[PDB]
Amino acid sequence: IHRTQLWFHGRISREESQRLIGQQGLVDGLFLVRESQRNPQGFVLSLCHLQKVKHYLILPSEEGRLYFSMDDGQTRFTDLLQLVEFHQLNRGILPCLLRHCCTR
C-alpha cells in the first residue's frame, strides 16, 4: 500500500493531525493522510485551507475490483497514492491543491 509514503501517518487522531498541520504553518495545501478512528475500513485526507484543517473521508469499495473514493464512487482511484498524486495536480472536490506534505 501507500504505507511507505511520508505523507501517510498511520493511525494518528484528527486532533493530532490538526496539531501536526498547524505546527507547520497552517498554509493552504499542507496535508497528510491517516487511518480513520471512526470508519475502520477508511482513511482520512487532512488538509489545510483558509487557516482551517479540514478532513476528507476516503472509503474503499469493490465487481470485485477495489478502489478508493471521497465522493461515493463518482471519482475513483486505484490506491491512496494515486489519489494523493492526482490531487496534487487537480482540485477535484477539494478546496485547493495538495501542495506540501506534512512529513512523518
Binding site: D71, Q74, G92, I93
Partner: peptide, 8 residues
C-alpha cells in the same frame, strides 16, 4: 460548487 449544494 455551491454552498449546501452537491454540484461538482
Amino acid at each position: 460548487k455551491f454552498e449546501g449544494x452537491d454540484n461538482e
